[PDB]
């Protein structure tokens, strides 16, 4: 007679509502477990994400609490939209969880990133990546943390992006990924926008090579394989570091820094035709620019986005969509809880 009713996708138990049909597990997706369904009210599919007691700690409820106030808060064709949000549950006493639903992709971009990629297609993922980016900035939210595992495409090439990024410790064998972080973040050195495009960098980069640009363990690994490469930055970039990290980096071993036509040789590129030669030599050039240590040095989101590999996307209306109520501080769980179920049922 209720509107729920209980499946079991994996190990997992989903209690969701009448109208999802037919639940299989698709991916990671972070936060949890995703589900793929038929929602027999709108007559399309849907994916749809368990958020198991968010509140059970201040990292997982601080973050949780800051998706679902900022999902209604950005609109944008390739940012997160919900289509819906419930809980099984009827009051804040039995609050238990929470469930997320939206529009259902087909792929990461971690697959993707797998393939081997056309320019027309490889640059129109990075322009809507780059147009989710600059909205999110203009509604004041600077990422921080994308990674190809938290960006879903369709098979028409639309991408979206999942999770608005960071704002610390953990309980499970569930490890975050790092390697696609700015030298800002890995350094502790106060950032701006183009913090993000760094992201985009390591993403377009691993598109190119099908290799982690910069792996490792920790951060200490990480550094080295971005000097290895990029080269030590210049004294400029480190006089803007804190007296502790300064120390560490300056006295890091230095290195000359490979350029880029050999970091990323024309053998990896399609150049058997005139058209892939020039784009070629183009999506070598915003690479350079995007992987650059320096964040003064650094491209910004909208010199990018009028990059002449980029630029072949614009439309008039294609970005324009302004922003249509704030963090909060130290909570318990029992005031996430209520803070998390209020979002709920707003
Ligand atoms: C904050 O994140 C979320 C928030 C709310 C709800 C979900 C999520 N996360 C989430 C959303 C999507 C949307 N599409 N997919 C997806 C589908 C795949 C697939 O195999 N589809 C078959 C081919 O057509 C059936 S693979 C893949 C990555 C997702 C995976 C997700 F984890």
């Given at each position: 007679?209720?509107?729920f009713y209980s499946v079991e996708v994996g190990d997992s138990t989903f209690t969701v509502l009448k109208?999802y049909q037919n639940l299989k597990p698709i991916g990671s997706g972070a936060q949890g477990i995703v589900c793929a369904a038929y929602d027999?009210?709108?007559?399309?599919n849907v994916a749809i994400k368990k958020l198991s007691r968010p509140?059970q700690?201040?990292?997982h409820?601080?973050?949780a609490?800051?998706?679902?106030?900022?999902?209604?808060?950005?609109?944008?064709?390739?940012?997160?939209?919900?289509?819906?949000?419930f809980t099984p549950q009827?009051?804040?006493?039995?609050?238990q969880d929470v469930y997320l639903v939206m529009?259902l992709m087909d792929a990461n971009?971690c697959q993707?990133?797998?393939?081997?990629?056309?320019?027309?297609?490889?640059?129109?993922?990075?322009?809507?990546?780059?147009?989710?980016?600059?909205?999110?900035?203009?509604?004041?939210?600077?990422?921080?943390?994308?990674?190809?595992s938290n960006?879903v495409?369709?098979?028409?090439?639309?991408?979206?992006?999942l999770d608005?990024?960071?704002?610390?410790?953990m309980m499970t064998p569930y490890v975050?990924?790092?390697?696609?972080?700015?030298?800002?973040?890995?350094?502790?050195?106060?950032?701006?926008?183009?913090?993000?495009?760094?992201?985009?960098?390591?993403?377009?980069?691993?598109?190119?090579?099908?290799?982690?640009?910069?792996?490792?363990?920790?951060?200490?690994?990480?550094?080295?394989?971005?000097?290895?490469?990029?080269?030590?930055?210049?004294?400029?970039?480190?006089?803007?570091?804190?007296?502790?990290?300064?120390?560490?980096?300056?006295?890091?071993?230095?290195?000359?820094?490979?350029?880029?036509?050999?970091?990323?040789?024309?053998?990896?590129?399609?150049?058997?035709?005139?058209?892939?030669?020039?784009?070629?030599?183009?999506?070598?050039?915003?690479?350079?620019?995007?992987?650059?240590?320096?964040?003064?040095?650094?491209?910004?989101?909208?010199?990018?986005?009028?990059?002449?590999?980029?630029?072949?996307?614009?439309?008039?209306?294609?970005?324009?969509?302004?922003?249509?109520?704030?963090?909060?501080?130290?909570?318990?769980?029992?005031?996430?809880?209520?803070?998390?179920?209020?979002?709920?049922?707003?």
């Amino acid at each position: 007679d209720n509107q729920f009713y209980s499946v079991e996708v994996g190990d997992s138990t989903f209690t969701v509502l009448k109208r999802y049909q037919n639940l299989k597990p698709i991916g990671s997706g972070a936060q949890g477990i995703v589900c793929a369904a038929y929602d027999a009210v709108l007559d399309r599919n849907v994916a749809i994400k368990k958020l198991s007691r968010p509140f059970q700690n201040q990292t997982h409820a601080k973050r949780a609490y800051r998706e679902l106030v900022l999902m209604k808060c950005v609109n944008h064709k390739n940012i997160i939209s919900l289509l819906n949000v419930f809980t099984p549950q009827k009051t804040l006493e039995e609050f238990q969880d929470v469930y997320l639903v939206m529009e259902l992709m087909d792929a990461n971009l971690c697959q993707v990133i797998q393939m081997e990629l056309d320019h027309e297609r490889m640059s129109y993922l990075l322009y809507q990546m780059l147009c989710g980016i600059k909205h999110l900035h203009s509604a004041g939210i600077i990422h921080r943390d994308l990674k190809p595992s938290n960006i879903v495409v369709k098979s028409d090439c639309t991408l979206k992006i999942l999770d608005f990024g960071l704002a610390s410790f953990m309980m499970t064998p569930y490890v975050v990924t790092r390697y696609y972080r700015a030298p800002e973040v890995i350094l502790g050195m106060g950032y701006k926008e183009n913090v993000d495009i760094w992201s985009v960098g390591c993403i377009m980069g691993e598109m190119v090579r099908h290799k982690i640009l910069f792996p490792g363990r920790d951060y200490i690994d990480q550094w080295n394989k971005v000097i290895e490469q990029l080269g030590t930055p210049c004294p400029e970039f480190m006089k803007k570091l804190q007296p502790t990290v300064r120390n560490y980096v300056e006295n890091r071993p230095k290195y000359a820094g490979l350029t880029f036509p050999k970091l990323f040789p024309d053998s990896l590129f399609p150049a058997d035709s005139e058209h892939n030669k020039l784009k070629a030599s183009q999506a070598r050039d915003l690479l350079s620019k995007m992987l650059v240590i320096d964040p003064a040095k650094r491209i910004s989101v909208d010199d990018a986005l009028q990059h002449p590999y980029i630029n072949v996307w614009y439309d008039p209306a294609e970005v324009e969509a302004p922003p249509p109520q704030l963090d909060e501080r130290e909570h318990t769980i029992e005031e996430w809880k209520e803070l998390i179920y209020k979002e709920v049922m707003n």
